[PDB]
Amino acid sequence: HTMKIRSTKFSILNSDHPRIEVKKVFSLSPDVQVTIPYRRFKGKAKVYFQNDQIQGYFSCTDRQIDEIKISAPKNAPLLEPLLDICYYGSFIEPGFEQTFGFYPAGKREFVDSFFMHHSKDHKAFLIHMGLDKDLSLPLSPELNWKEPALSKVCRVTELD
């Protein structure tokens, strides 16, 4: 049932369809290509996640996150599990349909690149969700839980 990405555990609570594999082909030249498959959702899904003392669920439609609900310690840095969620759904680029600015050799490399790149700069997550003027929302743009800021990550709230 359960899957793991790095230290984050995932359990699908419900979903329209089983997860699908996309076999993405990158062309290096007319007669040389690299195929790097990735998994994603077709239609709707609601998925539980857990990483040590952080947990919650997200809802998505295809490759768009619709909401995330979280329980975590005050001031917890949520970058790591949030990138694990992003990987699990193929929610942000680069790393799925887009390369990191050079041709990838295969999946192992492409996964390592994803976590290096987006850990150094996670702006793709902020762009995916959007930023909100509603300062009552819990997630700061640096992805720290309940940190004050002049904007907050859209559609990320505390668990009921």
Residue numbers in the entry: 326 to 485
From the paper:
The three largest gene segments of the Thogotoviruses, THOV, DHOV and JOSV are homologous to those of IAV and code for the heterotrimeric polymerase. In this paper we present the atomic structures of the putative PB2 cap binding and 627 domains of THOV and the putative PA N-terminal endonuclease domains of THOV and DHOV. Despite very low sequence homologies, all domains have similar folds to those of the corresponding IAV polymerase domains.
A construct comprising residues 323–486 could be expressed, crystallised in two different forms, and its structure determined at 1.8 Å resolution. Secondly, the prominent, solvent exposed ‘424-loop’ of the IAV cap-binding domain is absent due to truncation in THOV. The THOV domain is not retained by m7G Sepharose under conditions where IAV cap-binding domain is and, similarly, no binding of m7GTP could be detected by isothermal calorimetry experiments under conditions where IAV cap-binding domain shows clear binding with a Kd of 2.7 µM.
